[PDB]
A paper describes a structure:
Here, we report four crystal structures of HsmtPheRS mutants, and extensive MD simulations for wild‐type and nine mutants to reveal the structural changes on dynamic trajectories of HsmtPheRS.
Mutations in the mitochondrial aminoacyl‐tRNA synthetases (mtaaRSs) can cause profound clinical presentations, and have manifested as diseases with very selective tissue specificity.
Numbering used by the authors: 11 to 415
The structure:
Amino acid sequence: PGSVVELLGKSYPQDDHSNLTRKVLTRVGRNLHNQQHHPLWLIKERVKEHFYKQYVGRFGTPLFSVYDNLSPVVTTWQNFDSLLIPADHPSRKKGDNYYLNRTHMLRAHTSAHQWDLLHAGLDAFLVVGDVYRRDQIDSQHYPIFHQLEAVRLFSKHELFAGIKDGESLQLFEQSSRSAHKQETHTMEAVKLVEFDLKQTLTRLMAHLFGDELEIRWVDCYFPFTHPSFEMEINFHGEWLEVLGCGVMEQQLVNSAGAQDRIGWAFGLGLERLAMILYYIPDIRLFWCEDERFLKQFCVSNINQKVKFQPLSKYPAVINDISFWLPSENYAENDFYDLVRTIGGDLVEKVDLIDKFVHPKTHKTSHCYRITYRHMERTLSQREVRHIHQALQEAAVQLLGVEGRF
């Protein structure tokens, strides 16, 4: 912890919100999504190719400009306010974000760029980048992952171009908001935008996974879209959400300068997609540099089909860690950072298997079961003991927790 943070050549004074970790910092700028041949870059190029094809292939398809090198450091206004996220919304919890301070943060999603790009006059674009969130620790969650945003605007004439008396139809009106549309949108408009959205995503998935993937649309919520959806893909007997989307909140589109227009947007988890497309077991493999893994994504063209062969799964070592939280001063996702710092990518997952308050003291006890597993080799009991003991001492010094063990 400190007084000034220096990130990407810029300086940020620290305050009550500051909670960025040196570990996260060592990863900012990495840009896996722009790394030639990396599984993520691969998915990026394939999505890009699809959009390009569609532009040249169909007259109605617009040209999508692509931005994959925007700095992840944004203002809380870009990441939250511009997307209409309430001041008291849980997604703002310091516990789930990496804030430099009260006004700047590492983006939690690529949607943080929607407003500025809209304000710049663009009608169709894609933003691809690393995003950051403080989350639990397991093979499916990492503090850093990547997303690809897409925004598509429609003018009234463009939307109803294929309808006989379409110029008589409108985009806007003043009714009420319902489960199916916004208060200022016509059902006519929404039905067409929604259909375009789903057809676009469905075709993209078809291009990425082939005609023989099981997908389902699920209704959800986002403060920046409505109606909103999550597309899920059934993989290994299990419906997994791979993207979020919907019809852009008109207030957002209006404040950016495009009253005129109505649009849709979506944000899809490149990791999630990659893990499904190539089986990848574990999110941590995206960050290793074991050429048993990377060498498998060295294709002649992004069209050559990678036939990923999962590495061996080495034995894990499991150790529990208990302690006392301080006096009303502690967060779960905190200890999770001490863990990422000390155990790094050696930790496969952390589980809070138990927690209780002592009557006398008033002083809550936490017991975490940490699974230590190397993605590249067999960890010995010895080295794990050393990492586990360092985590133990660190907890006691830098989480005011008491050595209960």
